[PDB]
Amino acid sequence: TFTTAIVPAAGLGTRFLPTTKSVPKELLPVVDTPAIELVADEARQAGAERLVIVTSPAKQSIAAYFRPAPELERSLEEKGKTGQLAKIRRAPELLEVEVAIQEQALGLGHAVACAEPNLGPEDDVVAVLLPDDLVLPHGILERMAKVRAEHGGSVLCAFDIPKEEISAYGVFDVSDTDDADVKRVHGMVEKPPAEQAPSTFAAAGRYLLDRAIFDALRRIEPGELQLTDAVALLIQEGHPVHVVVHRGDRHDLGNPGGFLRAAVDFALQDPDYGPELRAWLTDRIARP
Amino acid sequence: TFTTAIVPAAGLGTRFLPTTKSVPKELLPVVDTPAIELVADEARQAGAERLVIVTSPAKQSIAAYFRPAPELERSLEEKGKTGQLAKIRRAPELLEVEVAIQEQALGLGHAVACAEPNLGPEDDVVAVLLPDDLVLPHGILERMAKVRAEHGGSVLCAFDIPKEEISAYGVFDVSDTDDADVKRVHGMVEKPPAEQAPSTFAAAGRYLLDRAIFDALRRIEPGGELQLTDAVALLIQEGHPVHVVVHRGDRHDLGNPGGFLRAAVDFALQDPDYGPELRAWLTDRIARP
Ligand SMILES: [K+]
Ligand SMILES: [K+]
């Protein structure tokens, strides 16, 4: 399977201004843990050995997150904070992390293209994880790998969303396969009204891209490089593209509202917070 | 009244690990805005002209937050994001900001004492705001300034907490004044059990300290930790007036992820961009594990 996962992390996160003026969006805590760690863990569990984070020069603190912190570790160990200590050791031990620095945030297609110098002869396919999407539980990339193994080519991800709730998404035009959760991708429609939606399958931020994507990204017309256009070009030129339908849960960290739903969902499942938080929420929602 | 506010911000925020390995606790967003902004804004609205942030070398980034971002401002203006532009211009425009470097987090008293080099002749009194306490609405420091005007000396802040729920706090030993929300401070008891708590007045993280505190912090015995309560006790013993104002409004505690989330939810429910959707989601969510 794939060994390299790419995380595009170039965008400011304008919905979290003013905080994202100074703090990388991908380091914001979900309860106590940054999304960059959550997606790094997902990638590792799907068998990534390497993570290529694409970011801006201002967001290099992301890199330092994945390096050991000797003094802090020694301090926690001396206080007997074994739980906090394990929690800080987790991210640095997940995988080999590299940062591809992109001077200007010019969109997702450009961010993926800037990862190409970090790839090697073994990278026939790369995983891509968008860090604003949490796809739960872990394992969507493993299902996508099964599809790559059977059909070759590239693999996308979809959420199954009713046509009347889908108009914020890219929506796949598809044909059936022998697996109910796997479709062949014919195209994508951006933000269709319900009556024009070609399917209930909404583009989700997980990919297994064949190396052919980099050539496709070089040959698309800018106007910012759209990854969808590069995928559309591959489909034109006969490259197989399938999509796996995620059936489980998801969170959207793209704006504070979605971010808070994720943090609350996770905090309610944690005994350090859950019971007291549940009691507080019960009363709080009964008043303005 | 006071012109300099001091914000102690030297501690890691060990309860927010692993995030605070890389992100200063005081930059974490409440919905979209960091605590450091919320306390700078409070301080400005109480008439501060200057902010002295006490932090470690590794957390100097807090300072950059208070510098303009011309390129970002331009890009927001060109997209017609006038709301977002206003939101990023706010913190740099609030007041003059300085940082005092405290290589080691030796505590609150140490932090306050490391701010003294940033004071000038006109700083007879300083405000101190702990960024983990949000005291709502704005205005507690103005109430404390009234007390300083009447009695001189130094002024603390308390929440009114039942004795069955107060044992996590420092608790004041007090006497009455002619104002029901103003007490004379005799002393403080650290984390009393309910039956030993001398009052229901729990120490909150707002202060108006007379300059005398620095000398007191120089004369008290170190742990090299410098306990601020020991410096205030020394002043009390030496006849320096110390009163406390009882906050009657709301509060949030950003000291741990649980109280942080309560703050963020409380604020998001009042924000039309998020409130209605969030409230409907919460309604369903709390009805299941
Ligand atoms: K962790
Ligand atoms: K999406």
User: From CA B169, how far away is CA B163, in angstroms rounded?
Assistant: 10
Does residue A88 belong to the interface with chain B, where contact is any CB pair within 8 Å? yes
Report which residue type is found at B74: R
Ligand nearest to the CA of A93: 1
Token pair 């007045």 in the structure block, residue: B201
How many helical (H) and strand (E) elements, i.e. helices and strands, does chain B have? 10, 13
Quick one: resolution in A?
1.8
Does residue A163 belong to the interface with chain B, where contact is any CB pair within 8 Å? no
Do residue A267 and residue B257 have CB atoms under 8 angstroms apart? Answer: yes
Which CATH number applies to A4-254: 3.90.550.10, 3.40.50.970, 3.40.50.300, 3.40.50.2300?
3.90.550.10
Q: Are B77 and B70 in contact (CB under 8 A)?
A: no
Residue list, CB under 5 A from ion ligand 1: A 87, 90; B 18
User: From CA A259, how far away is CA A250, in angstroms rounded?
Assistant: 11
Coil, strand or helix: which one is B28?
coil
Does residue A276 belong to the interface with chain B, where contact is any CB pair within 8 Å? yes
Interface of B with A in 211-270 (CB under 8 A): 257-258, 261-262, 264-266, 268-270
| Sign of the C-alpha dihedral computed for residues B238, B183, B221 and B214 taken in this order | negative
Q: Are B204 and B159 in contact (CB under 8 A)?
A: yes
DSSP element (H, E) containing B134:
strand B133-136
Distance B257 CA to ligand 2 centre (A): 27
Q: Are B229 and B170 in contact (CB under 8 A)?
A: yes
Token pair 């070759």 in the structure block, residue: A152
- Structure-token pair, residue A134: 């949490």
Domains of chain A, residue spans: 4-254, 255-288
Does residue A177 belong to the interface with chain B, where contact is any CB pair within 8 Å? no
Does residue A21 belong to the interface with chain B, where contact is any CB pair within 8 Å? yes
Which CATH number applies to B4-255: 3.90.550.10, 3.40.50.300, 3.40.50.720, 3.40.140.10?
3.90.550.10
Chain B hits for A281, CB-CB cut-off 8 Å, are: 265, 282, 286
Q: Which one-letter DSSP state was computed for residue B114? A: H
